[PDB]
PDB file of all heavy atoms in Angstrom:
ATOM      1  N   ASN S  12     -41.043  -0.858 -19.030  1.00  0.00           N
ATOM      2  CA  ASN S  12     -41.630  -2.117 -18.580  1.00  0.00           C
ATOM      3  C   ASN S  12     -41.585  -3.141 -19.709  1.00  0.00           C
ATOM      4  O   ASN S  12     -41.935  -2.838 -20.853  1.00  0.00           O
ATOM      5  CB  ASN S  12     -43.086  -1.911 -18.146  1.00  0.00           C
ATOM      6  CG  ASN S  12     -43.493  -2.865 -17.050  1.00  0.00           C
ATOM      7  OD1 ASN S  12     -42.674  -3.565 -16.475  1.00  0.00           O
ATOM      8  ND2 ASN S  12     -44.788  -2.919 -16.754  1.00  0.00           N
ATOM      9  N   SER S  13     -41.151  -4.341 -19.393  1.00  0.00           N
ATOM     10  CA  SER S  13     -41.007  -5.402 -20.398  1.00  0.00           C
ATOM     11  C   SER S  13     -42.348  -5.991 -20.828  1.00  0.00           C
ATOM     12  O   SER S  13     -42.452  -6.483 -21.944  1.00  0.00           O
ATOM     13  CB  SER S  13     -40.091  -6.508 -19.882  1.00  0.00           C
ATOM     14  OG  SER S  13     -40.810  -7.396 -19.052  1.00  0.00           O
ATOM     15  N   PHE S  14     -43.342  -5.954 -19.943  1.00  0.00           N
ATOM     16  CA  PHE S  14     -44.667  -6.553 -20.201  1.00  0.00           C
ATOM     17  C   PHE S  14     -44.463  -8.064 -20.374  1.00  0.00           C
ATOM     18  O   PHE S  14     -43.869  -8.711 -19.521  1.00  0.00           O
ATOM     19  CB  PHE S  14     -45.361  -5.834 -21.354  1.00  0.00           C
ATOM     20  CG  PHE S  14     -45.541  -4.369 -21.105  1.00  0.00           C
ATOM     21  CD1 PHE S  14     -44.981  -3.415 -21.930  1.00  0.00           C
ATOM     22  CD2 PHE S  14     -46.304  -3.934 -20.028  1.00  0.00           C
ATOM     23  CE1 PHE S  14     -45.170  -2.068 -21.704  1.00  0.00           C
ATOM     24  CE2 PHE S  14     -46.490  -2.579 -19.800  1.00  0.00           C
ATOM     25  CZ  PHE S  14     -45.932  -1.670 -20.639  1.00  0.00           C
ATOM     26  N   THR S  15     -44.925  -8.654 -21.493  1.00  0.00           N
ATOM     27  CA  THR S  15     -44.860 -10.099 -21.648  1.00  0.00           C
ATOM     28  C   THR S  15     -44.064 -10.503 -22.873  1.00  0.00           C
ATOM     29  O   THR S  15     -44.502 -11.351 -23.650  1.00  0.00           O
ATOM     30  CB  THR S  15     -46.266 -10.689 -21.733  1.00  0.00           C
ATOM     31  OG1 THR S  15     -46.888 -10.279 -22.970  1.00  0.00           O
ATOM     32  CG2 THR S  15     -47.118 -10.211 -20.578  1.00  0.00           C
ATOM     33  N   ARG S  16     -42.902  -9.899 -23.067  1.00  0.00           N
ATOM     34  CA  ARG S  16     -42.046 -10.195 -24.222  1.00  0.00           C
ATOM     35  C   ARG S  16     -40.911 -11.122 -23.813  1.00  0.00           C
ATOM     36  O   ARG S  16     -40.471 -11.120 -22.658  1.00  0.00           O
ATOM     37  CB  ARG S  16     -41.482  -8.915 -24.809  1.00  0.00           C
ATOM     38  CG  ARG S  16     -42.497  -7.783 -24.962  1.00  0.00           C
ATOM     39  CD  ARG S  16     -43.597  -8.161 -25.961  1.00  0.00           C
ATOM     40  NE  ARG S  16     -43.067  -8.259 -27.311  1.00  0.00           N
ATOM     41  CZ  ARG S  16     -43.813  -8.468 -28.397  1.00  0.00           C
ATOM     42  NH1 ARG S  16     -45.124  -8.605 -28.293  1.00  0.00           N
ATOM     43  NH2 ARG S  16     -43.226  -8.539 -29.579  1.00  0.00           N
ATOM     44  N   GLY S  17     -40.442 -11.907 -24.765  1.00  0.00           N
ATOM     45  CA  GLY S  17     -39.271 -12.738 -24.550  1.00  0.00           C
ATOM     46  C   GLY S  17     -39.548 -14.206 -24.277  1.00  0.00           C
ATOM     47  O   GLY S  17     -38.946 -14.811 -23.405  1.00  0.00           O
ATOM     48  N   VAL S  18     -40.481 -14.807 -25.023  1.00  0.00           N
ATOM     49  CA  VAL S  18     -40.804 -16.204 -24.898  1.00  0.00           C
ATOM     50  C   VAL S  18     -40.357 -16.938 -26.138  1.00  0.00           C
ATOM     51  O   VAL S  18     -40.662 -16.531 -27.271  1.00  0.00           O
ATOM     52  CB  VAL S  18     -42.318 -16.400 -24.685  1.00  0.00           C
ATOM     53  CG1 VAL S  18     -42.674 -17.874 -24.611  1.00  0.00           C
ATOM     54  CG2 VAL S  18     -42.792 -15.685 -23.437  1.00  0.00           C
ATOM     55  N   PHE S  37     -35.400 -17.322 -18.625  1.00  0.00           N
ATOM     56  CA  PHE S  37     -36.395 -16.515 -19.302  1.00  0.00           C
ATOM     57  C   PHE S  37     -36.313 -15.064 -18.831  1.00  0.00           C
ATOM     58  O   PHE S  37     -35.613 -14.764 -17.843  1.00  0.00           O
ATOM     59  CB  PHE S  37     -37.824 -17.051 -19.076  1.00  0.00           C
ATOM     60  CG  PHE S  37     -38.079 -18.349 -19.718  1.00  0.00           C
ATOM     61  CD1 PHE S  37     -37.973 -19.532 -19.010  1.00  0.00           C
ATOM     62  CD2 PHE S  37     -38.488 -18.418 -21.036  1.00  0.00           C
ATOM     63  CE1 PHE S  37     -38.243 -20.747 -19.610  1.00  0.00           C
ATOM     64  CE2 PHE S  37     -38.738 -19.620 -21.641  1.00  0.00           C
ATOM     65  CZ  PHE S  37     -38.609 -20.794 -20.930  1.00  0.00           C
ATOM     66  N   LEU S  38     -36.978 -14.184 -19.530  1.00  0.00           N
ATOM     67  CA  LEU S  38     -37.111 -12.785 -19.132  1.00  0.00           C
ATOM     68  C   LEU S  38     -38.383 -12.641 -18.312  1.00  0.00           C
ATOM     69  O   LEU S  38     -39.485 -12.867 -18.822  1.00  0.00           O
ATOM     70  CB  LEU S  38     -37.177 -11.885 -20.350  1.00  0.00           C
ATOM     71  CG  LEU S  38     -37.289 -10.391 -20.091  1.00  0.00           C
ATOM     72  CD1 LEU S  38     -35.925  -9.796 -19.728  1.00  0.00           C
ATOM     73  CD2 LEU S  38     -37.876  -9.673 -21.287  1.00  0.00           C
ATOM     74  N   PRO S  39     -38.279 -12.253 -17.025  1.00  0.00           N
ATOM     75  CA  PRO S  39     -39.494 -12.222 -16.178  1.00  0.00           C
ATOM     76  C   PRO S  39     -40.521 -11.241 -16.668  1.00  0.00           C
ATOM     77  O   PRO S  39     -40.202 -10.226 -17.285  1.00  0.00           O
ATOM     78  CB  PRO S  39     -38.914 -11.796 -14.813  1.00  0.00           C
ATOM     79  CG  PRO S  39     -37.454 -12.112 -14.881  1.00  0.00           C
ATOM     80  CD  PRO S  39     -37.058 -11.876 -16.292  1.00  0.00           C
ATOM     81  N   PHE S  40     -41.772 -11.565 -16.406  1.00  0.00           N
ATOM     82  CA  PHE S  40     -42.879 -10.721 -16.815  1.00  0.00           C
ATOM     83  C   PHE S  40     -42.857  -9.406 -16.067  1.00  0.00           C
ATOM     84  O   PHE S  40     -42.540  -9.357 -14.870  1.00  0.00           O
ATOM     85  CB  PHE S  40     -44.224 -11.429 -16.573  1.00  0.00           C
ATOM     86  CG  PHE S  40     -44.605 -12.398 -17.651  1.00  0.00           C
ATOM     87  CD1 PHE S  40     -43.684 -12.924 -18.508  1.00  0.00           C
ATOM     88  CD2 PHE S  40     -45.925 -12.757 -17.822  1.00  0.00           C
ATOM     89  CE1 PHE S  40     -44.042 -13.823 -19.496  1.00  0.00           C
ATOM     90  CE2 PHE S  40     -46.309 -13.654 -18.805  1.00  0.00           C
ATOM     91  CZ  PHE S  40     -45.343 -14.178 -19.634  1.00  0.00           C
ATOM     92  N   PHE S  41     -43.206  -8.326 -16.757  1.00  0.00           N
ATOM     93  CA  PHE S  41     -43.234  -6.963 -16.199  1.00  0.00           C
ATOM     94  C   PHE S  41     -41.908  -6.624 -15.556  1.00  0.00           C
ATOM     95  O   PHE S  41     -41.811  -6.401 -14.332  1.00  0.00           O
ATOM     96  CB  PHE S  41     -44.380  -6.827 -15.218  1.00  0.00           C
ATOM     97  CG  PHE S  41     -45.743  -7.108 -15.824  1.00  0.00           C
ATOM     98  CD1 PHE S  41     -46.310  -8.361 -15.714  1.00  0.00           C
ATOM     99  CD2 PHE S  41     -46.411  -6.112 -16.497  1.00  0.00           C
ATOM    100  CE1 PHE S  41     -47.537  -8.618 -16.274  1.00  0.00           C
ATOM    101  CE2 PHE S  41     -47.654  -6.372 -17.052  1.00  0.00           C
ATOM    102  CZ  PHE S  41     -48.202  -7.625 -16.945  1.00  0.00           C
ATOM    103  N   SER S  42     -40.860  -6.603 -16.361  1.00  0.00           N
ATOM    104  CA  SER S  42     -39.510  -6.372 -15.901  1.00  0.00           C
ATOM    105  C   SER S  42     -39.050  -4.954 -16.219  1.00  0.00           C
ATOM    106  O   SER S  42     -39.661  -4.222 -16.985  1.00  0.00           O
ATOM    107  CB  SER S  42     -38.541  -7.384 -16.538  1.00  0.00           C
ATOM    108  OG  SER S  42     -37.322  -7.427 -15.846  1.00  0.00           O
ATOM    109  N   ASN S  43     -37.943  -4.561 -15.590  1.00  0.00           N
ATOM    110  CA  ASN S  43     -37.352  -3.229 -15.752  1.00  0.00           C
ATOM    111  C   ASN S  43     -36.292  -3.333 -16.812  1.00  0.00           C
ATOM    112  O   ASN S  43     -35.134  -3.733 -16.548  1.00  0.00           O
ATOM    113  CB  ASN S  43     -36.757  -2.750 -14.427  1.00  0.00           C
ATOM    114  CG  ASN S  43     -36.866  -1.259 -14.234  1.00  0.00           C
ATOM    115  OD1 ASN S  43     -37.441  -0.553 -15.060  1.00  0.00           O
ATOM    116  ND2 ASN S  43     -36.276  -0.774 -13.146  1.00  0.00           N
ATOM    117  N   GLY S 166     -48.693  -8.326 -25.971  1.00  0.00           N
ATOM    118  CA  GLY S 166     -49.086  -9.509 -26.705  1.00  0.00           C
ATOM    119  C   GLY S 166     -48.065 -10.617 -26.578  1.00  0.00           C
ATOM    120  O   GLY S 166     -47.038 -10.453 -25.899  1.00  0.00           O
ATOM    121  N   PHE S 167     -48.351 -11.719 -27.241  1.00  0.00           N
ATOM    122  CA  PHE S 167     -47.473 -12.884 -27.243  1.00  0.00           C
ATOM    123  C   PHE S 167     -46.947 -13.113 -28.655  1.00  0.00           C
ATOM    124  O   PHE S 167     -47.686 -13.055 -29.627  1.00  0.00           O
ATOM    125  CB  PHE S 167     -48.212 -14.149 -26.761  1.00  0.00           C
ATOM    126  CG  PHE S 167     -48.596 -14.076 -25.318  1.00  0.00           C
ATOM    127  CD1 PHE S 167     -49.881 -13.743 -24.944  1.00  0.00           C
ATOM    128  CD2 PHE S 167     -47.664 -14.378 -24.333  1.00  0.00           C
ATOM    129  CE1 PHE S 167     -50.227 -13.692 -23.603  1.00  0.00           C
ATOM    130  CE2 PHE S 167     -48.007 -14.340 -23.002  1.00  0.00           C
ATOM    131  CZ  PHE S 167     -49.294 -13.995 -22.631  1.00  0.00           C
ATOM    132  N   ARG S 209     -36.067 -19.346 -14.306  1.00  0.00           N
ATOM    133  CA  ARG S 209     -37.438 -19.338 -13.778  1.00  0.00           C
ATOM    134  C   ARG S 209     -38.206 -20.499 -14.395  1.00  0.00           C
ATOM    135  O   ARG S 209     -37.767 -21.138 -15.362  1.00  0.00           O
ATOM    136  CB  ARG S 209     -38.138 -18.003 -14.062  1.00  0.00           C
ATOM    137  CG  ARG S 209     -37.501 -16.811 -13.392  1.00  0.00           C
ATOM    138  CD  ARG S 209     -38.118 -15.513 -13.841  1.00  0.00           C
ATOM    139  NE  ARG S 209     -39.448 -15.309 -13.265  1.00  0.00           N
ATOM    140  CZ  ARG S 209     -39.666 -14.745 -12.080  1.00  0.00           C
ATOM    141  NH1 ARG S 209     -38.670 -14.346 -11.315  1.00  0.00           N
ATOM    142  NH2 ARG S 209     -40.903 -14.589 -11.662  1.00  0.00           N
ATOM    143  N   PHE S 211     -41.846 -21.616 -16.158  1.00  0.00           N
ATOM    144  CA  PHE S 211     -42.912 -21.064 -16.952  1.00  0.00           C
ATOM    145  C   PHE S 211     -43.900 -22.187 -17.339  1.00  0.00           C
ATOM    146  O   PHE S 211     -43.521 -23.345 -17.452  1.00  0.00           O
ATOM    147  CB  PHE S 211     -42.383 -20.416 -18.242  1.00  0.00           C
ATOM    148  CG  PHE S 211     -42.049 -18.960 -18.084  1.00  0.00           C
ATOM    149  CD1 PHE S 211     -41.239 -18.540 -17.041  1.00  0.00           C
ATOM    150  CD2 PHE S 211     -42.511 -18.038 -18.981  1.00  0.00           C
ATOM    151  CE1 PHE S 211     -40.912 -17.207 -16.906  1.00  0.00           C
ATOM    152  CE2 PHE S 211     -42.199 -16.687 -18.842  1.00  0.00           C
ATOM    153  CZ  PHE S 211     -41.388 -16.273 -17.803  1.00  0.00           C
ATOM    154  N   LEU S 212     -45.155 -21.782 -17.490  1.00  0.00           N
ATOM    155  CA  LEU S 212     -46.200 -22.684 -17.986  1.00  0.00           C
ATOM    156  C   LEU S 212     -46.630 -22.206 -19.371  1.00  0.00           C
ATOM    157  O   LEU S 212     -47.073 -21.061 -19.527  1.00  0.00           O
ATOM    158  CB  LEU S 212     -47.398 -22.680 -17.039  1.00  0.00           C
ATOM    159  CG  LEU S 212     -48.469 -23.748 -17.309  1.00  0.00           C
ATOM    160  CD1 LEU S 212     -48.011 -25.090 -16.762  1.00  0.00           C
ATOM    161  CD2 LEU S 212     -49.807 -23.334 -16.715  1.00  0.00           C
ATOM    162  N   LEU S 213     -46.467 -23.063 -20.367  1.00  0.00           N
ATOM    163  CA  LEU S 213     -46.683 -22.729 -21.769  1.00  0.00           C
ATOM    164  C   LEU S 213     -47.917 -23.439 -22.295  1.00  0.00           C
ATOM    165  O   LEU S 213     -48.144 -24.616 -21.960  1.00  0.00           O
ATOM    166  CB  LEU S 213     -45.463 -23.105 -22.611  1.00  0.00           C
ATOM    167  CG  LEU S 213     -44.128 -22.466 -22.185  1.00  0.00           C
ATOM    168  CD1 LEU S 213     -42.991 -23.172 -22.897  1.00  0.00           C
ATOM    169  CD2 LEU S 213     -44.136 -20.996 -22.474  1.00  0.00           C
ATOM    170  N   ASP S 223     -49.818 -18.655 -25.144  1.00  0.00           N
ATOM    171  CA  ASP S 223     -50.008 -18.124 -23.803  1.00  0.00           C
ATOM    172  C   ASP S 223     -48.941 -18.693 -22.887  1.00  0.00           C
ATOM    173  O   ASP S 223     -48.505 -19.834 -23.038  1.00  0.00           O
ATOM    174  CB  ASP S 223     -51.391 -18.426 -23.246  1.00  0.00           C
ATOM    175  CG  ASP S 223     -51.968 -17.300 -22.428  1.00  0.00           C
ATOM    176  OD1 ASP S 223     -51.177 -16.465 -21.935  1.00  0.00           O
ATOM    177  OD2 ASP S 223     -53.204 -17.210 -22.296  1.00  0.00           O
ATOM    178  N   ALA S 224     -48.520 -17.873 -21.907  1.00  0.00           N
ATOM    179  CA  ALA S 224     -47.511 -18.280 -20.957  1.00  0.00           C
ATOM    180  C   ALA S 224     -47.845 -17.691 -19.586  1.00  0.00           C
ATOM    181  O   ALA S 224     -48.508 -16.642 -19.488  1.00  0.00           O
ATOM    182  CB  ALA S 224     -46.099 -17.843 -21.366  1.00  0.00           C
ATOM    183  N   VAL S 225     -47.423 -18.382 -18.544  1.00  0.00           N
ATOM    184  CA  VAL S 225     -47.664 -17.966 -17.151  1.00  0.00           C
ATOM    185  C   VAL S 225     -46.359 -18.072 -16.408  1.00  0.00           C
ATOM    186  O   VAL S 225     -45.673 -19.102 -16.439  1.00  0.00           O
ATOM    187  CB  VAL S 225     -48.751 -18.847 -16.495  1.00  0.00           C
ATOM    188  CG1 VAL S 225     -48.657 -18.727 -14.984  1.00  0.00           C
ATOM    189  CG2 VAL S 225     -50.122 -18.407 -16.949  1.00  0.00           C
ATOM    190  N   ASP S 226     -45.975 -16.996 -15.727  1.00  0.00           N
ATOM    191  CA  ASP S 226     -44.780 -16.959 -14.872  1.00  0.00           C
ATOM    192  C   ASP S 226     -45.163 -17.411 -13.483  1.00  0.00           C
ATOM    193  O   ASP S 226     -45.966 -16.769 -12.788  1.00  0.00           O
ATOM    194  CB  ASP S 226     -44.198 -15.542 -14.835  1.00  0.00           C
ATOM    195  CG  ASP S 226     -42.832 -15.494 -14.228  1.00  0.00           C
ATOM    196  OD1 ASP S 226     -42.315 -16.567 -13.832  1.00  0.00           O
ATOM    197  OD2 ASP S 226     -42.270 -14.399 -14.100  1.00  0.00           O
ATOM    198  N   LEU S 229     -44.748 -14.660 -10.286  1.00  0.00           N
ATOM    199  CA  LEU S 229     -45.073 -13.237 -10.331  1.00  0.00           C
ATOM    200  C   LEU S 229     -45.915 -12.821  -9.139  1.00  0.00           C
ATOM    201  O   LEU S 229     -45.654 -11.790  -8.505  1.00  0.00           O
ATOM    202  CB  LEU S 229     -45.797 -12.923 -11.638  1.00  0.00           C
ATOM    203  CG  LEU S 229     -46.102 -11.449 -11.920  1.00  0.00           C
ATOM    204  CD1 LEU S 229     -44.814 -10.637 -11.990  1.00  0.00           C
ATOM    205  CD2 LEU S 229     -46.894 -11.331 -13.192  1.00  0.00           C
ATOM    206  N   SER S 233     -50.690 -16.472  -9.908  1.00  0.00           N
ATOM    207  CA  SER S 233     -49.894 -17.271 -10.839  1.00  0.00           C
ATOM    208  C   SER S 233     -49.424 -18.558 -10.200  1.00  0.00           C
ATOM    209  O   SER S 233     -49.369 -19.595 -10.853  1.00  0.00           O
ATOM    210  CB  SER S 233     -48.704 -16.446 -11.344  1.00  0.00           C
ATOM    211  OG  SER S 233     -49.147 -15.241 -11.926  1.00  0.00           O
TER     212      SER S 233
END
Side-chain angles (χ1 to χ4, degrees):
Chain S
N12 211 11
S13 82
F14 301 120
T15 68
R16 316 295 292 185
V18 178
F37 291 97
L38 180 80
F40 277 22
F41 302 95
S42 195
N43 213 5
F167 293 99
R209 297 173 74 86
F211 271 50
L212 190 79
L213 303 168
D223 218 337
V225 160
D226 191 2
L229 185 61
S233 304

